[PDB]
Each structure stands twice: as C-alpha cells, then as structure tokens.
C-alpha cells in the first residue's frame, strides 16, 4: 500500500541516487544493486540520478558495482547530474543512458585538500593527480571523447544542457515523453 | 627606560623574537633591525629567540633582513627555538650563535596545506616542495652539514639540547654565566 | 625618541605594507605617502611589502596614490608579495623595485563572490571581468609584458622566485647585501 | 605631529571618509568639517572617500554639513565610492570633485526593510520611497542628469569607471599626477 | 637584383624552412643562420616555417644552431608546422614566435624503425626512447607545460589552431596585419 | 630586362600562381609577396591565378600572407581557378578581384585521406572537418554569401563562369579589354 514508496519502486528494479554522494548513501545503492542482481541477474536495473557529486571513492564504489554486477545498469538523470553525478551517469550501460529535457549536466576535476608535512603533501598530491587522470580516462572511454577534450573540458566547471550531453556521448538520447 | 622595558633593551641593540612567527611580529622585528642598523652600521645586534616556529614567509622576511643589514646579528636561543625559530637562530652571525645551557632546539620539515582543484593542489604542492629545498640549503649553509645530512634529518621532528646544538653547527657556543 | 618604531622609520620616509590589504591599513599607508610627499615632494619614498593580498578596491586606493604623488615610490619585497601584494610591488617607480633574496611573489586573477538575481549577477560578473581586464593591463604596463602573456599567465596561481621576479620584469632587481 | 598621522593631515585640511558609513564614523567627519571651517572658512577642505556605502541618515548628516559650511568641500575618490559613498563624492563643490584613475564608482537605490504590522509596513514603505525620491532628485541636481536617467540607472547596481564618472557628471575630472 | 628571390630576403635576414626536414635543406638553413650571425650578431633572424616535419637529427642541427647563435631567432609559421616543424617553431626566441591566422600546428612523438637481431633491436628501442624523453623535456621547457603533460599530449597526433598554439604555449601570438 | 620574364614582370609588381598549390610554389609566391611590400608597401600587388587547386595548408600560407602584407592584393583569374585556386582568387582586395572574360571558376569542399587505427582516424577526420568549416566561414566572409549558402554550394563541385562568378560574389568584375 505504498507503505514505503522507494522499497516499492525497488520491485520494478528502480533505484534513486539523490544528493550528496558519500559512503553510506553510496553503500545503500550498492546493496540495492547487488540485491537486484540476485533477485534476477538478467533484467535491466534503473538508476535515476539527481545529484551534485560528492566524495569520489564512495562514488567509485557505486561505479564498480555497476560494472561488476551481471545486469545492465540504465541511468536517467533528472534535475542535475554534476561532477561525480555526471560520472556515474555516463557510466550507465551504453545506449541506456538518458536525460530528461531540462535536466542539466556539469563536469570538472577532482577536488581535494590535504594538510601536513611537505613529504606527506607530495604523497596525497601525487595521488589526487593519479585519480584526476584515471577519472579522465574512464570518462574518455564512456563518452567516446578523446583524453584531450575531457582534459580541456574538465579543467574548469563545464555545463551541458540535455541536447549537448547527447551530442557529447555522455548520455545516448533525450527521453521526452513516455511513448 | 623602565617606562617601556622592550624599548630600553633596544638601546643596547637587543631585539626579542618571542612566540609564534607571523607577519606582524616579524615586521616589528624587521623594523628594529633596520632601525638599529641605521643607529650604527657597525655595531653588532643581539636577538634572543624563544619561539616554537611559525609562518615561513614571515620568518623568511626576518632572515633576509638579517643577511642584508650592514651589522652582524648574534642570536641567543633560550627556552627553545623550533622550526622557523631554529632556522633564524642558526642563521645568526657566524661565531655569534649561542644557546643557554638548558634551552633546546628542534628542527623538522615544512608544514602546509591546500584546498581546491587537482590542478591547483599541484601548483601549490610544487611550491612548498621548492620552498622545502631552499630551506634545507640555507640550513646546510649556516650549519656545515651537507644538504643530504640535513634533508635526511629534517623529515621528522628532531630534538637537540644546547650540547648537540653546538655539536651540530646550529649554535657555535653555549653561554653559561656572563663575564 | 624611537617611540613607535614605525614613526621613527616614517621620518626616514620608509613605509610598511604588512598583512592582508583592506581599506583601513590601506587608508593608513596612503596617508603616510601623502604626508611624506608633503614633507618633501622631491625625495624618494620606500614601501616595504610583505602581504598575501587582499581587497582590490583597497589596493587600488594605494596604487593610484603611488602614481599620483610626485615622489618616486621604491618598493622592496620581504617574505612575500602575493596577488594585490605583487601588483603593488610592481607598481613602483621603474628602476626602484626590489625582491629580497628569498622573498617570493605570486600572481593570479580577481576573486569574487556574489549572491542575487540573474540580472544583478550579470551586472557584477561583467564588472569583475572588467576589473580583471584593467588589472591585467596595468600589469602588462609595469612588467613590460604583453597583455597577451599577462592574462594567459594569471588565469591560475603563478609563483615567482626573486630571480624569476626580476626576469619576469615584475621587479627590476634583487636587493642583496647592504651597500 | 605624526604621533597621529590623521591629525597631522587634518591640519592640511584633509579628511578621510573610510569604510562603512554609519553614525559615529559619520559624526567624526561632520566634526572635522565644522573644525576645519573654524580654523578658516575660506580654504577648501579636501575629503577623500574609499567607502562601500552605508546608512542613509548617516550619509545625509555629512551631506548637509557639507553644503552648509562655507569652505568649499572638494571630494577625491580612492579605491571606490559605492552607494552613499558615490553620493557624497558627487555632492562635492562643483569643479572640485575628482576620481583617481582606477577608483571605481557605483550607484544604486536605497536598501532597507521593516517588520511588524501592515499599517507600519506601509508607513515605512512610504517613507523609504519618499527618501528614494529625494535621493535621485539630489543626485540629478548634483550630476546634472535627468531625474529620469537617474531614476533609471539607480534601479539596479550600476558601475562607473573613472572616465564614465566624468562623462556622467558625477566627478569633474580625473586626478592622475601631482603637477 | 631580384635575380634569386630568397637570396634577396636573406638580406632582410629572412629565412625559410619549407617542406620535408632532412639533412641537406636543414644544413642550408643552418648555414644561413651562421652567415647572418657573421654579418650582424645583434639583429634578429626571422625563420618562416611551413613544414610537415621530418628527420629528428636533421632538425636538431637547426635547433641547437638556433640556440647557439647570438641572434634571437624569431619564428613565424605559415601553412602548418607539424612534428619537427612545430618543435623548431617553438624553439624560437621566447616572446618572438607566431602563427599566421590560419596556420595549424600538430605535435606528436618520434617515429622510426629497425630490423635486426633481438640484441640490436633493444639498443635501438632504448635509444628512440631517450630521444623521446629529450624532446618532451625540450618541449616542456619551451612551451612552459609540465613534462608529463607534454608526454601525455604527444602520445598521438594532436592538432592545434594558432589560437590553441598561443594558449598551449608553442607560439607567443598570432600575426594578422602588418603595422 | 626580359632575361627572366617572370622577374621582369615582378617590377611591375606582378605575380603568377600557376598549377597545383603545394608548399614550394606557394613559398615562392609568399616570398615575392613579402619582397614587394618591402619595396613599397603602398602600391597594389597583382596575383594572376590559373590553378586547379592544391594542398590546403600550402594555400593558406599564401592566404594569410595576402591579408597580412600592407600592399593590397589584386587577384586576376585567367583560364581557371578551382578549389584553392577559387579561394585565393576571391580572397584578393575587395574591389580589386577580377576574371578574364572566359575564365572559369570551380568551388567545393576539402579532400583528404588517412590510414591507421580507429583512434587516429578519428583525430584526422575531426581535423579535416574543423578545416572545412573554417574554409567555409572564410568563403562567406569574402563573397558576402550566407554561411549556410556556401556550405550548400560546396558539397559538390559547382562550376561558375565569369559572370556567374561576379554575381556569386567571388570576384567583383570582369576585365575584357585593356582600356
């Protein structure tokens, strides 16, 4: 009886990624993902996305589980998919990634901040550059775009309307009307 | 006079570097150095030091005014001299860098931190790393140790009583009783 | 009687720009300059700089006084001259601007933050791009660089050594040892 | 003497209007004007201005004191003059109002707000509106522009470089070099 | 007389690098630079570049020749500057390098080949790797970019319009109209 | 004298572009172009064109040189001017471009080819397209035709006789008898 709306939508194999991406909320998407694999490792899974990004590693826990699990993971971004939100979005299974008409996307680069000794600082700094780069490769690969474009387009906050994210390979098309 | 105690002591060409180093206290110190040099380009200046360290750039505005002014600068560490404060101490006029018997010096590497994009984390990371290099050099200089000995013994916090101070090159001799 | 040490240095036509730039410290530095010009409109004036930057409107209060008064204004950098700090250091009389041996300079672009309606947001962004524009020109003027190279060089935090400072044409030479 | 640099410059008939505008800082300038008028009501009083604006009644106490006293009050703008600061800068004796080269101006409309019953909200709403009407009238009068061009440009924040400020008739000329 | 047209422009110190870069034409270009330095070692030398590149050692005799002669070699690119062409284009005197409005640059890595025993092949794959490293370094120096950035960017042919060349740091600006 | 007919007609400031456009013939044209401006930058230059086209870059080195030297460059098609011959023709000084009575002009898009890996084929196709656009823009720009109109007209070879050329905006008029 729509006792719990989301639990109910989990029976249509739909999952919601909303807001701040961080460990726990991420973990709750993983746990859903896995649960759906088992309930049926053959049917498609739905990941709706309206988020501004967040802690990356947490963000990556979702990503790897989207690949790891048997079923294809379709993604539909509504409202906004930014930074890490844009990533998991374009990480949907090819041909199954969407954008509602006025949703909007944003890309940019790994953000961070360490504090301590010079020695330690080079350590964590070298690390963020590696991640900055991997994230760029994994993005080059899901978008079909060169490492040059990503690198340039992601050095600074960059926005895309629904048409443009399609035109960029980020999502495959625009769902305008449930026909 | 005893109207203002730090003033009278100044007439003897004696300056105090107390507590943390930061732009303003450093500045007051730099003016006293400029002023005293203009009181007598040839008369040896005395600077006691009881500091736990502080802002590099700020300390470094003291050091450069130190190696710049016509006069010689004798430094007397007391209580303690740490980080930047160890630097300036072992940076006094060769042959006029002391320590009281129970004061203690402590050296180490530079501290720091930055928040922002990977790209900027980098700019700011290369810098402190450079800033680190120059620091080990001057230390290498004014002390006698090789760069290497310095580079190696500064990674971590290192304590030194006045004896070891001397045995290191930081201070030349150990005051005990005046005569 | 060498009461306020800064008064004493002021009688020596010497002026100190320490710390964050803001209307009041700036108002104080500007008043010092006028008074000095009044004392003797022909003699040089010395401006020591060790600032991390600050407010542009307040820094420009200084910039325009420097250029306004008859007395040439020699600038010397100890510790650091960053952002508006560096802009003022280079804003000195050509030929009389210096960098202590281990001071370090830093340049970048205008920073801002506004909150409001799209319409007002545009009046302000537009405005800061002009300020960013007029800024980069003044910088190209004082350093002998092309406007082209200035902007392209200030988009992100750029650090400069004293050697690089002089080489960039940001300061004519490095004050070394008294003479 | 120089034990107080602003008292000294005051003796040369210079008054500094710096920072936020408000009763006490305003009342000090009002007092310095009545003072300067007393030492001689013939020589021009010079009021520098580096303000972001502030309280309207507090600005109006300076405005009125200015027109009242006999000495022509000449205004010079440094850094910036926004809102009430733009208004005071222009209420300066015609022929004697200046902007330094890179000082930027800013006009807009009155800010305010009430809280309580409707009858009171109306009473104060009416009052701020009557205050707005006299302000544009005065601005019109002093800058010599149509009360409509003024009613118009003050609706939203509006920036003026030093030259446009001359074109607009806000100031009379630009001060560049002492000659 | 306009008997030989290039022999004529050579008197205006203009030198053309056209087509395939290979030992003999390269040697002709070097000889003109040496000859120009003999005539007047103070005056600049303009090198017009229109080339798809060519042999590395052939080009390096020009590179070093450029850096060795007293005159600053100013480089102007027309048509295109690819591979060894983009390289010599950027090795021109800092501040004096340009791209006609519609010239285009391409950068990439060394190309080569060997036939032989496994032991000979290893000496050669090692070597082309050392050449690879010096070019990236020399490219890093000359463009101002960082090593890894240059490496990362050259792995595959990269096109760059003149504006992108100016941004990237290969050339200093775009020549459009003689004035 | 008529020892070298081409050199002799160079004195009447005449230049011929005969045959396929390739780097070398292009260079000889650019150099004669620079040479003439150098002899007198005010008098017009006459570039006769009878070519079928050629290497785009080779052509552009010529284009940019035409727009760059001060001398105005009058273009005169004889026989025929297609592809890059068409482009350089309609690229001469507005008002000073012609067409002998029975000249024939042909226009169309870029030709090209590449062999290699999917990745590298992408980069090169991406490039001949950036070029096409730019080439079109420039055609629009010089014939005042709609940008879209040129895109259309240049999808497939389109022959234009002299009148049609004049009309299409490629050349201004037609020369039939030397009056």
Tell me which DSSP letter residue C19 carries.
S
Tell me which DSSP letter residue D169 carries.
T
Element spanning D163, H or E: helix D162-167
The answer to whether D69 and D39 have CB atoms below 8 angstroms apart is no
Q: Which residue of F has its CA nearest to E16?
A: F27
Task: Record the resolution, in angstroms.
Answer: 2.6
Alpha-helix residue ranges (DSSP H) falling in D41-117: 56-68, 84-90
- Identity of the residue in C9, C104, C157 whose CB atom sits nearest the CB atom of B123: C157
Residues in A lying within 8 Å of E, measured between beta carbons: 147-148
Q: How far apart are CA B49 and CA E86, in angstroms?
A: 57
What is the 3-class SS of B25-85, one letter each residue? HHHHHHHHHHHHHCCCCCCCEEEEEEECCECHHHHHHHHHHHCCCCCCEEEEEEEEEECHH
The answer to whether B97 and B83 have CB atoms below 8 angstroms apart is no
Closest CA to C164 of C156, C174, C177: C174
Neighbouring C-beta atoms of residue B144, cutoff 10 Å: 12
Q: Nearest C-alpha of chain B: how many angstroms from A51?
A: 19
Q: Which chains would you list as touching C if contact means 3+ CB atom pairs under 8 Å?
A: B, D, E
Question: Are B121 and A115 inside 8 Å of each other by CB?
Answer: no
Judge residue F176's burial from the number of C-beta atoms within 10 Å of its C-beta, 0-12 exposed, 13-18 middle, 19 or more buried.
Answer: exposed
Both tokens assigned to E15: 């030198």
Strand partners, D173: D98
Q: How far apart are CA B96 and CA B110, in angstroms?
A: 26
Both tokens assigned to B81: 């001299």
Question: Are A115 and B113 inside 8 Å of each other by CB?
Answer: yes
Buried b (16+ CB within 10 A) or exposed e, C75-84: bbbbbbbbbb
Judge residue E126's burial from the number of C-beta atoms within 10 Å of its C-beta, 0-12 exposed, 13-18 middle, 19 or more buried.
Answer: exposed
Q: How far apart are CA F178 and CA D125, in angstroms?
A: 83
The residues near A142 (Cβ < 8 Å, ≥ 6 apart) are: A90, A91, A94, A169, A170
Q: How far apart are CA E134 and CA E131, in angstroms?
A: 5
Please count the helices (runs of H) and the strands (runs of E) in chain C.
7, 6
Both tokens assigned to C142: 């004082």
Strand partners, A76: A48, A98
Judge residue D113's burial from the number of C-beta atoms within 10 Å of its C-beta, 0-12 exposed, 13-18 middle, 19 or more buried.
Answer: exposed
Q: How far apart are CA E146 and CA B123, in angstroms?
A: 11
CB-facing half-sphere around the CA of F135: CA atoms within 13 A: 26
Both tokens assigned to D129: 């509106």
Both tokens assigned to C161: 């050594």
Coil, strand or helix at C151: helix
The answer to whether E98 and E172 have CB atoms below 8 angstroms apart is yes
- Identity of the residue in E2, E51, E178 whose CB atom sits nearest the CB atom of F10: E2
Strand partners, C33: none
Neighbouring C-beta atoms of residue F9, cutoff 10 Å: 15
Q: How far apart are CA C91 and CA C159, in angstroms?
A: 18
- Identity of the residue in E79, E101, E156 whose CB atom sits nearest the CB atom of F123: E156
Give the dihedral sign, CA A32/A36/A41/A45. negative
Where are any strands of DSSP class E within chain D? 14-18, 45-51, 73-82, 97-99, 104-107, 158-160, 173-174
Q: Which residue of D has its CA nearest to C119?
A: D156
Buried b (16+ CB within 10 A) or exposed e, D18-47: bbebeeebbeebbebbeebbeeeeeeebbb
The answer to whether C21 and C58 have CB atoms below 8 angstroms apart is yes
Q: How far apart are CA F93 and CA F91, in angstroms?
A: 7
With vertex at residue E76, the alpha carbon angle to CA E75 and CA E81, rounded to the nearest 5 degrees, is 95
Element spanning D44, H or E: none
Q: Which chains would you list as touching E if contact means 3+ CB atom pairs under 8 Å?
A: A, C, F
Q: Which residue has the tokens 């396929």?
A: F20
Q: How far apart are CA C31 and CA C112, in angstroms?
A: 27
Q: How far apart are CA C7 and CA D5, in angstroms?
A: 9
| Mutation target vs E (from F30, F41, F114; most E CBs, 10 A cutoff) | F30
Q: Nearest C-alpha of chain C: how many angstroms from D1?
A: 10
Q: Which residue of F has its CA nearest to E51?
A: F23
Q: Could you give the C-alpha distances from E119 to B29, E122, E125, in angstroms and in order?
A: 67, 5, 10
- Identity of the residue in B23, B63, B127 whose CB atom sits nearest the CB atom of C102: B63
Q: Nearest C-alpha of chain C: how many angstroms from B34?
A: 8
The answer to whether D67 and D94 have CB atoms below 8 angstroms apart is no
Q: Could you give the C-alpha distances from E23 to B133, E26, E28, E49, in angstroms and in order?
A: 44, 5, 9, 16
Q: How far apart are CA E154 and CA B107, in angstroms?
A: 44
The answer to whether C109 and C132 have CB atoms below 8 angstroms apart is yes
Give the dihedral sign, CA E137/E142/E144/E145. negative
φ, ψ at F112 (rounded to 5°): 175, 175
Length of chain C: 179
With vertex at residue F174, the alpha carbon angle to CA F169 and CA F179, rounded to the nearest 5 degrees, is 145
Q: Could you give the C-alpha distances from A25 to A30, A90, B89, in angstroms and in order?
A: 9, 20, 53
The answer to whether C57 and C87 have CB atoms below 8 angstroms apart is no
Closest CA to B93 of B23, B20, B13: B13
Give me the helix-helix angle, A56-68 and A118-143, nearest 10°.
Answer: 40
Experimental method: X-ray
Range of the domain at A157: 1-179
The residues near F19 (Cβ < 8 Å, ≥ 6 apart) are: F25, F51, F52, F54
Coil, strand or helix at C50: strand
Closest CA to C21 of C98, C84, C86: C84
Question: Are A131 and B118 inside 8 Å of each other by CB?
Answer: yes
Neighbouring C-beta atoms of residue E16, cutoff 10 Å: 25
Both tokens assigned to C49: 């700089």
Q: How far apart are CA A117 and CA A123, in angstroms?
A: 10
Both tokens assigned to B170: 């930081």
Alpha-helix residue ranges (DSSP H) falling in F40-169: 56-68, 83-89, 118-143, 147-153, 162-168
Closest CA to E133 of E107, E156, E153, E110: E110
Closest CA to B102 of B47, B49, B161, B157: B161
Q: Nearest C-alpha of chain F: how many angstroms from E178?
A: 6
Question: Are F69 and E156 inside 8 Å of each other by CB?
Answer: no
Query: C–D: how many Cβ contacts below 8 A?
Result: 89
Buried b (16+ CB within 10 A) or exposed e, C91-110: bbbeebbbbbbbbbbbbbbb
Q: Which position among D108, D124, D161, D173 bears the catalytic label?
A: D108
Q: How far apart are CA C158 and CA C173, in angstroms?
A: 19
The answer to whether C172 and C98 have CB atoms below 8 angstroms apart is yes
Closest CA to B101 of B73, B74, B79, B75: B79
Q: Which residue has the tokens 């200015």?
A: D66
CB-facing half-sphere around the CA of A134: CA atoms within 13 A: 8
The answer to whether C65 and C33 have CB atoms below 8 angstroms apart is yes
Element spanning A128, H or E: helix A118-143
Strand partners, C15: C47
Q: Nearest C-alpha of chain C: how many angstroms from D20?
A: 10
Coil, strand or helix at A140: helix
Question: Are B65 and C80 inside 8 Å of each other by CB?
Answer: no
Both tokens assigned to C35: 């008074």
Q: Which residue of C has its CA nearest to E96?
A: C146
The residues near D104 (Cβ < 8 Å, ≥ 6 apart) are: C57, C60, C131, D80, D159, D160, D161, D162
* Total domains present in chain D: 1
Both tokens assigned to B151: 């580079």
Q: How far apart are CA D175 and CA D156, in angstroms?
A: 28
Active-site residue flag, E108: yes
The residues near C143 (Cβ < 8 Å, ≥ 6 apart) are: C90, C150, C168, C169, C170
Q: How far apart are CA F79 and CA F86, in angstroms?
A: 12
Q: How far apart are CA B29 and CA B7, in angstroms?
A: 12
Residues in A lying within 8 Å of B, measured between beta carbons: 108-119, 121-122, 125, 128-129, 131-132, 155
Q: Which residue has the tokens 């172009």?
A: F33
Q: How far apart are CA C49 and CA C46, in angstroms?
A: 10
Closest CA to A32 of A55, A16, A43: A16
Neighbouring C-beta atoms of residue D3, cutoff 10 Å: 9
The CATH number that applies at residue B59 is 3.90.226.10
Q: Which position among D7, D51, D61, D83 bears the catalytic label?
A: D83
For residue B128, which residues of chain A lie inside 8 Å, CB to CB?
Answer: 118, 121
Tell me which DSSP letter residue A18 carries.
E
Q: Which residue has the tokens 């920073």?
A: C111
Coil, strand or helix at E160: strand
Q: How far apart are CA E109 and CA B29, in angstroms?
A: 55
Both tokens assigned to D165: 């400020």
Question: Are E158 and A147 inside 8 Å of each other by CB?
Answer: no
For residue D104, which residues of chain C lie inside 8 Å, CB to CB?
Answer: 57, 60, 131
Q: How far apart are CA B105 and CA B171, in angstroms?
A: 10
Q: How far apart are CA A15 and CA E84, in angstroms?
A: 54
For residue A148, which residues of chain E lie inside 8 Å, CB to CB?
Answer: 153, 158
The answer to whether E42 and E77 have CB atoms below 8 angstroms apart is no
The answer to whether A72 and A88 have CB atoms below 8 angstroms apart is no
CB-facing half-sphere around the CA of F13: CA atoms within 13 A: 17
φ, ψ at B38 (rounded to 5°): -80, 0
CA–centroid distance for B151 within its chain: 18
Q: Which residue has the tokens 């998407």?
A: A29
Report the DSSP pairing between strands E173-174 and E97-99.
parallel
Closest CA to A30 of A62, A57, A6, A64: A62
Both tokens assigned to A90: 């374009």
Element spanning F155, H or E: none
Q: Could you give the C-alpha distances from B116 to A58, A117, C151, C155, in angstroms and in order?
A: 19, 18, 21, 15
The residues near C156 (Cβ < 8 Å, ≥ 6 apart) are: B119, B120, B123, C108
């Amino acid at each position: 009886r729509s006792f719990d709306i989301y639990s109910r939508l989990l029976k249509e194999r739909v999952i919601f990624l909303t807001g701040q991406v961080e460990d726990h909320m991420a973990n709750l998407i993983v746990a859903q993902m896995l649960f759906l694999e088992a309930e049926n490792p053959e049917k498609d899974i739905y990941l709706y996305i309206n988020s501004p990004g967040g802690v990356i590693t947490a963000g990556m826990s979702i990503y790897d589980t989207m690949q790891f699990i048997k079923p294809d993971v379709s993604t539909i971004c509504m409202g906004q998919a930014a930074s890490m939100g844009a990533f998991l979005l374009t990480a949907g299974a090819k041909g199954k990634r969407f954008c509602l008409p006025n949703s909007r996307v944003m890309i940019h680069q790994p953000l961070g901040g360490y504090q301590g000794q010079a020695t330690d600082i080079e350590i964590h700094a070298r690390e963020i550059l590696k991640v900055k780069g991997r994230m760029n490769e994994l993005m080059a690969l899901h978008t079909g775009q060169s490492l040059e474009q990503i690198e340039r387009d992601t050095e600074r906050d960059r926005f895309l309307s629904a048409p443009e994210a399609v035109e960029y390979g980020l999502v495959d098309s625009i769902l305008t009307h449930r026909n």
